[PDB]
Design an enzyme around this catalytic site. Structure first.
Site, PDB file in Angstrom:
ATOM      1  N   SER A 293      24.180  13.559   0.968  1.00 23.55           N
ATOM      2  CA  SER A 293      25.239  13.445  -0.021  1.00 23.55           C
ATOM      3  C   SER A 293      24.753  13.416  -1.489  1.00 23.55           C
ATOM      4  O   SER A 293      25.552  13.680  -2.396  1.00 23.55           O
ATOM      5  CB  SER A 293      26.081  12.152   0.310  1.00 23.55           C
ATOM      6  OG  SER A 293      27.185  12.595   1.027  1.00 23.55           O
TER       7      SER A 293
ATOM      8  N   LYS B 214      25.364  16.563  -3.693  1.00 17.36           N
ATOM      9  CA  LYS B 214      26.556  16.744  -4.540  1.00 17.36           C
ATOM     10  C   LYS B 214      26.249  16.711  -6.027  1.00 17.36           C
ATOM     11  O   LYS B 214      27.016  17.283  -6.782  1.00 17.36           O
ATOM     12  CB  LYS B 214      27.606  15.647  -4.208  1.00 17.36           C
ATOM     13  CG  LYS B 214      28.127  15.718  -2.769  1.00 17.36           C
ATOM     14  CD  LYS B 214      29.331  14.824  -2.578  1.00 17.36           C
ATOM     15  CE  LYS B 214      29.780  14.864  -1.124  1.00 17.36           C
ATOM     16  NZ  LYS B 214      29.202  13.805  -0.292  1.00 17.36           N
TER      17      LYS B 214
ATOM     18  N   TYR C 150      36.654  10.155  -1.173  1.00  8.67           N
ATOM     19  CA  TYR C 150      35.358  10.833  -1.104  1.00  8.67           C
ATOM     20  C   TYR C 150      35.508  11.997  -0.109  1.00  8.67           C
ATOM     21  O   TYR C 150      35.905  11.776   1.024  1.00  8.67           O
ATOM     22  CB  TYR C 150      34.275   9.803  -0.666  1.00  8.67           C
ATOM     23  CG  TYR C 150      33.061  10.406  -0.014  1.00  8.67           C
ATOM     24  CD1 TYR C 150      32.457  11.438  -0.563  1.00  8.67           C
ATOM     25  CD2 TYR C 150      32.605   9.967   1.262  1.00  8.67           C
ATOM     26  CE1 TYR C 150      31.394  12.058   0.013  1.00  8.67           C
ATOM     27  CE2 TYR C 150      31.525  10.567   1.876  1.00  8.67           C
ATOM     28  CZ  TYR C 150      30.921  11.629   1.244  1.00  8.67           C
ATOM     29  OH  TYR C 150      29.859  12.261   1.827  1.00  8.67           O
TER      30      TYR C 150
ATOM     31  N   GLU D 102      28.452   8.132 -10.245  1.00  6.53           N
ATOM     32  CA  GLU D 102      29.300   6.944 -10.312  1.00  6.53           C
ATOM     33  C   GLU D 102      28.601   5.936 -11.213  1.00  6.53           C
ATOM     34  O   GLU D 102      27.369   5.791 -11.169  1.00  6.53           O
ATOM     35  CB  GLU D 102      29.488   6.373  -8.904  1.00  6.53           C
ATOM     36  CG  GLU D 102      30.236   7.297  -7.947  1.00  6.53           C
ATOM     37  CD  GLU D 102      29.909   7.065  -6.478  1.00  6.53           C
ATOM     38  OE1 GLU D 102      29.294   6.033  -6.138  1.00  6.53           O
ATOM     39  OE2 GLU D 102      30.258   7.970  -5.682  1.00  6.53           O
TER      40      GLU D 102
ATOM     41  N   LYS E 182      23.950   7.149  -7.448  1.00 10.87           N
ATOM     42  CA  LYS E 182      24.476   7.971  -6.371  1.00 10.87           C
ATOM     43  C   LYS E 182      23.645   7.712  -5.091  1.00 10.87           C
ATOM     44  O   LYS E 182      22.443   7.838  -5.113  1.00 10.87           O
ATOM     45  CB  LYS E 182      24.454   9.457  -6.731  1.00 10.87           C
ATOM     46  CG  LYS E 182      25.121  10.347  -5.688  1.00 10.87           C
ATOM     47  CD  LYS E 182      26.619  10.159  -5.645  1.00 10.87           C
ATOM     48  CE  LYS E 182      27.302  10.922  -4.545  1.00 10.87           C
ATOM     49  NZ  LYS E 182      27.130  10.199  -3.254  1.00 10.87           N
ATOM     50  N   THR E 183      24.340   7.423  -3.981  1.00 10.11           N
ATOM     51  CA  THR E 183      23.718   7.288  -2.695  1.00 10.11           C
ATOM     52  C   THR E 183      23.669   8.691  -2.047  1.00 10.11           C
ATOM     53  O   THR E 183      24.487   9.570  -2.348  1.00 10.11           O
ATOM     54  CB  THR E 183      24.516   6.377  -1.718  1.00 10.11           C
ATOM     55  OG1 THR E 183      25.897   6.815  -1.661  1.00 10.11           O
ATOM     56  CG2 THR E 183      24.493   4.986  -2.154  1.00 10.11           C
ATOM     57  N   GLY E 184      22.794   8.818  -1.073  1.00  8.61           N
ATOM     58  CA  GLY E 184      22.760  10.012  -0.281  1.00  8.61           C
ATOM     59  C   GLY E 184      22.244   9.688   1.110  1.00  8.61           C
ATOM     60  O   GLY E 184      21.161   9.146   1.257  1.00  8.61           O
ATOM     61  N   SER E 185      22.971  10.144   2.124  1.00  6.05           N
ATOM     62  CA  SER E 185      22.555   9.919   3.499  1.00  6.05           C
ATOM     63  C   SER E 185      22.721  11.168   4.365  1.00  6.05           C
ATOM     64  O   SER E 185      23.598  11.963   4.147  1.00  6.05           O
ATOM     65  CB  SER E 185      23.345   8.751   4.114  1.00  6.05           C
ATOM     66  OG  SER E 185      23.057   7.525   3.485  1.00  6.05           O
TER      67      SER E 185
END
Ligand SMILES: [Cl-]
Ligand SMILES: [Sr+2]
Ligand SMILES: [Sr+2]
Ligand SMILES: [Sr+2]
Length: 357
Positions: free
Chosen positions: A58, A61, A144, A266, A309-312
Site C-alpha cells: 500500500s 500509492k 480507503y 496522511e 504512510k503505512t504499507g503492507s
C-alpha cells in the site's frame, strides 16, 4: 551515535514481533543512513543488504499519487475535473461526478476497498466502474480504496498518453534516481527478493492482480524510498516540476477527525500523541467510512506536521514518517506483516530518541 538510538529499538522490535529482517533509512540534513538487520529469507538466512528488495504494498500509492500530481503540474491532468473527461469510456457513470482529487484522497463516493473477484481484467474493471453506484456523499466521506487509487493511476496514464509502469519509471523513478524500484522483479534480481512472512510465520509472496501496479505492486529498497523522502523534504536535487509535483502531494485536502488527508500521504499537526497515530492505522479509520471535510482555508504543504504512510502485503510491513519541520524522515521496511501499532510505536521512539520530536 544515531545507531545507538536506532539499533536497540529495532532489535527489540524484531524480537517482540519475530520479524526475520528489516531495512531502515534515516533521512536528515547531513545525510541518509541505511541500516540492515537480520534475514531476507528466514529459511535460507541470506542476510538483508543494500540489494534486498521488499514488498511495500500500500505504500505504492504514494508513487501513484506523485505521478498524478506531476501530470497535474504539466497541465495534462485537471484534479477537479470528472474522471470521465480523461476516461471517456466512463462517460455517463458516477465518474462524471468524481474527480482525480477525490480518488487521491479516498473521497470517491464510497468506492470500495477491494477489487471484486468478478473483475479479472481492464475491460471487466471498466464495466464494473460503469455500473457502480456511490454509497457515500462524494467529497464528504473517506473510504480507503484500491479501486480508487487504481482508477487515479488509469486516469493519470491516459492523461499522459503512456502506459502506467513505463511512464512512472521515466517521469518519477528515474529522475529521483530510484533504480532499484520494480513493479516486476527481474529474473536477475530474484536472489535479492526478500521472502515475506505472514502473521502465522508462513512464507508468502504477493500475487499479481488487477490494479496491482497502481495500488500495491512495488518491490524496492529502503534506500530507494529514502530518495522519495529526501525530495519530499527538499533535501534532493530535483527538476523543478517534479519538485512541485512532490510538494503538492503534501497539500492538505480533507480534515478527517484528527487526521488530515493529503494526496495519499496522511498527516497530523504537532505535537501528536502516538494513540492518535495508532487510531489512524486502525480498523475504525481503514475499514469504515469516515466523515471528511474539504479544507477551504486551503492548506499549502505544512512545516509543523507528522506525515505518514503505512504499507503492507500478507508478508511485509512498511512505514514512512516525515517531519518536514526537522527535515527528517524515516523508512522502516520489514519482511513480516507486523501490527501497525508496533510500527507507530517504534517510529515514535526512534524519532523522539533522535531528538526530532
Ligand atoms: Cl484489491
Ligand atoms: Sr480547480
Ligand atoms: Sr498490472
Ligand atoms: Sr508499548
Amino acid at each position: 551515535q544515531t545507531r545507538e538510538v536506532l539499533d536497540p529499538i529495532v532489535a527489540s522490535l524484531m524480537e517482540a514481533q519475530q520479524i526475520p529482517g528489516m531495512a531502515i533509512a534515516l533521512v536528515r540534513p547531513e545525510g541518509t543512513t541505511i541500516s540492515h538487520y537480520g534475514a531476507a529469507d528466514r529459511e535460507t538466512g541470506t542476510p538483508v543488504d543494500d540489494d534486498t528488495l521488499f514488498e511495500i504494498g500500500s505504500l505504492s500509492k504514494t508513487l501513484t499519487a506523485t505521478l498524478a500530481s506531476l501530470a497535474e503540474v504539466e497541465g495534462k491532468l485537471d484534479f477537479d475535473a470528472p474522471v470521465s473527461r480523461y476516461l471517456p469510456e466512463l462517460e455517463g457513470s458516477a465518474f462524471d461526478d468524481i474527480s482525480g482529487l477525490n480518488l487521491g484522497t479516498h473521497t470517491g463516493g464510497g468506492l470500495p476497498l477491494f477489487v471484486p473477484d468478478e473483475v479479472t481484467d481492464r475491460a471487466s474493471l471498466m464495466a464494473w466502474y460503469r455500473e457502480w453506484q456511490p454509497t457515500e456523499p462524494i467529497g464528504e466521506s473517506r473510504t480507503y480504496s484500491n479501486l480508487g487509487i487504481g482508477l487515479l493511476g488509469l486516469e493519470t496514464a491516459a492523461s499522459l498518453d503512456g502506459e502506467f509502469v513505463p511512464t512512472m519509471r521515466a517521469k518519477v523513478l528515474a529522475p529521483l534516481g530510484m533504480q532499484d524500484t520494480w513493479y516486476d522483479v527481474p529474473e536477475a534480481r530474484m536472489a535479492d527478493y526478500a521472502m515475506g512472512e505472514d502473521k502465522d510465520g508462513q512464507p508468502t509472496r504477493v500475487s499479481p492482480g488487477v490494479l496491482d501496479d497502481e495500488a500495491y505492486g512495488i518491490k524496492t529498497t529502503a534506500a530507494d524510498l529514502a530518495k522519495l523522502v529526501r525530495a519530499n523534504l527538499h533535501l534532493a536535487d530535483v527538476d523543478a516540476e517534479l519538485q512541485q509535483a512532490i510538494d503538492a502531494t503534501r497539500q492538505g485536502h480533507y480534515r478527517v477527525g484528527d487526521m488530515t488527508q493529503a494526496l495519499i500521504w496522511e498527516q497530523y499537526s504537532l505535537p501528536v500523541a502516538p494513540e492518535t497515530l495508532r487510531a489512524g492505522q486502525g480498523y475504525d479509520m481503514i475499514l469504515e467510512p469516515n466523515a471528511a471535510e474539504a479544507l477551504e482555508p486551503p492548506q499549502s504543504p505544512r512545516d509543523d506536521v507528522w506525515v505518514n504512510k503505512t504499507g503492507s502485503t500478507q508478508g511485509f510491513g512498511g512505514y514512512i514518517v516525515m517531519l518536514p519541520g526537522k527535515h527528517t524522515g524515516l523508512v522502516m521496511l520489514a519482511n513480516k506483516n507486523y501490527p501497525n501499532d508496533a510500527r507507530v510505536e517504534a517510529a515514535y521512539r526512534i524519532l523522539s530518541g533522535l531528538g526530532a520530536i
